[PDB]
Structures are given as C-alpha cells and as structure tokens.
Amino acid sequence: RMKQLEDKVEELLSKKYHLENEVARLKKLV
Amino acid sequence: RMKQLEDKVEELLSKKYHLENEVARLKKLV
C-alpha cells in the first residue's frame, strides 16, 4: 500500500510528462 | 508518509486533467 501509492505517483508523473510533451508540440503548430 | 503520498497523487491527478483539457483545446485550434 505504501508501494501502491508510490507506483501510482510514478504512473501519474509519466502520464503527466506525456501530456506536457504533446502540448509543446501543439503549441508549436499554433 | 501515507498521507503525503495521498496528497501527491491528488495533486498530480488535478494536473493531468488540466493538461488533458488544454490538450483538447489546442487540437481544436489546429
């Protein structure tokens, strides 16, 4: 459970990074 | 600790949603 929360923060960090890369990209097609 | 981790997850999830919506907006524009 502590591990499950840890893994969870990790996952969301990843997804978050993806989302910011995409925005960069779209921000460059503007 | 347990509670900090819980707080990190909530904060990250909020960011994620903010990014997904931004993302959806940009694409609409390009």
Q: What is the DSSP code string of A1-30?
A: -HHHHHHHHHHHHHHHHHHHHHHHHHTT--
Burial of B14 (0-12, 13-18, 19+ CB in 10 A): exposed
Round to whole Å and give the CA distance between B7 and A16. 16
Residues of chain A in contact with residue B11, where contact means CB-CB under 8 angstroms, are none
Round to whole Å and give the CA distance between B20 and B6. 21
- The answer to whether the CB of B5 falls within 8 A of the CB of A9 is yes
Residues of chain B in contact with residue A2, where contact means CB-CB under 8 angstroms, are 2, 5
Q: Which of B19, B29, B30 is facing A19, going by the closest CB pair?
A: B19
Round to whole Å and give the CA distance between A14 and A6. 13
Cα-trace Rg, chain A:
13
Experimental method: X-ray
| Residue type at B3 in one-letter notation | K
CA separation (Å) from B8 to B14, B15, B17, B22? 10, 11, 14, 21
**Resolution, rounded to a tenth of an Å?**
1.8
Q: Which of B8, B9, B19 is facing A20, going by the closest CB pair?
A: B19
